[PDB]
Design a binder for this molecule. Structure first.
Ligand SMILES: CCCCCCCCO[C@@H]1O[C@@H](C)[C@@H](O)[C@@H](O[C@H]2O[C@H](C)[C@H](O)[C@H](O[C@@H]3O[C@H](CO)[C@@H](O)[C@H](O)[C@H]3O)[C@@H]2OC(C)=O)[C@@H]1O
Ligand SMILES: Nc1nc2c(ncn2[C@@H]2O[C@H](COP(=O)(O)O)[C@@H](O)[C@H]2O)c(=O)[nH]1
Length: 257
């Protein structure tokens, strides 16, 4: 089979899809499959992709219901041991795929790296229960997940048009999926009210006893956006509900007990 499958959802990505594909095809030391899931682009996207005429490239081009619908189609079609998702405006750095393969050959089901955004490292968090009161702990495009991880966790939830990837990683955490974080840049490259609303909803899916405002308080508090003096009240209010919730808060807020 293939060591790696890269799923690349595209729509009107003619400006950058070529650089994206070049960053994948240059990866040495792995057998790689590429699945481009195009949403019906009217521009030169499909032409550019097909200029990469190869058998390890599959092109799907049909209307879909958004980015995560396309991602789900690509993940379902992947035949690589480890599956990555790369956007058409993103690029993998040199040697990332061999690093992924190296770390996966030891049994780990998820390998994630760092993300460079506008010349800055994404402010990642640990893959652990504390992530469940926050967003996605690493950049989604820096994440590689095995076939077994996807089989166990499932596909992305189309109800979350923005933060389905966070919701997926939280399900991974709750399913005890093993993760290895690599301290190397793997990848370089919407209303804010909407992003926050989805992020709070995802957290409520972990802890459904939470009111929306309590999920927002925890998210802002872990992210360093808001105060944390109420954390002990939330813990006393809900600590009886779930040890996983207690673990998340005491990992995220070590000063509290
Ligand atoms: C109301 C005042 C409190 C402070 C507000 C936030 C400060 C500025 O933050 C920026 O705007 C908000 C809306 C977010 O867009 C921030 O992005 C981070 O927080 C998000 C919740 C999200 O976790 C995001 O990571 C990306 O998430 C998407 C969807 O899950 C994912 O596809 C990408 O791969 C992730 O990079 C950001 O998280 C971090 C640690 O950067 C934004 O910074
Ligand atoms: N297949 C598909 N891809 C999309 C859709 N919307 C955005 N994309 C692609 O998903 C990635 C995210 O880019 P964004 O538009 O979120 O900045 C890019 O590769 C973009 O071309 C869509 O509706 N369908």
């Amino acid at each position: 089979e293939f060591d790696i499958t890269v799923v690349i959802p595209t729509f009107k990505a003619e400006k950058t899809v070529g650089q994206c594909l070049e960053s994948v095809l240059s990866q040495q030391g792995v057998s790689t499959e590429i699945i481009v899931v195009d949403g019906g682009s009217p521009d030169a996207t499909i032409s550019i992709v097909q200029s990469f005429s190869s058998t390890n490239l599959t092109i799907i081009s049909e209307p879909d219901r958004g980015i995560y619908d396309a991602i789900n189609k690509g993940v379902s079609r992947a035949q690589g041991g480890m599956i990555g998702v790369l956007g058409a405006d993103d690029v993998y750095k040199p040697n990332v795929l061999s690093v992924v393969k190296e770390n996966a050959s030891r049994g780990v089901e998820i390998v994630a790296g760092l993300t460079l955004i506008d010349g800055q490292l994404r402010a990642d968090e640990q893959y652990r229960p504390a992530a469940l009161i926050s967003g996605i702990p690493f950049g989604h495009n820096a994440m590689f997940a095995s076939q077994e991880a996807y089989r166990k966790v499932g596909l992305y939830d189309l109800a979350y048009r923005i933060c389905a990837d966070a919701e997926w990683v939280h399900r991974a955490i709750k399913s005890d999926i093993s993760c290895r974080k690599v301290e190397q840049v793997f990848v370089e490259f919407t209303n804010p009210e909407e992003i926050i609303a989805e992020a709070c909803s995802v957290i409520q899916r972990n802890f459904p006893f939470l009111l929306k405002e309590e999920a927002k308080y925890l998210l802002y508090g872990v992210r360093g956006w808001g105060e944390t003096s109420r954390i002990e009240q939330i813990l006393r209010k809900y600590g009886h509900e779930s040890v996983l919730f207690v673990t998340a808060l005491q990992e995220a807020f070590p000063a509290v007990e």
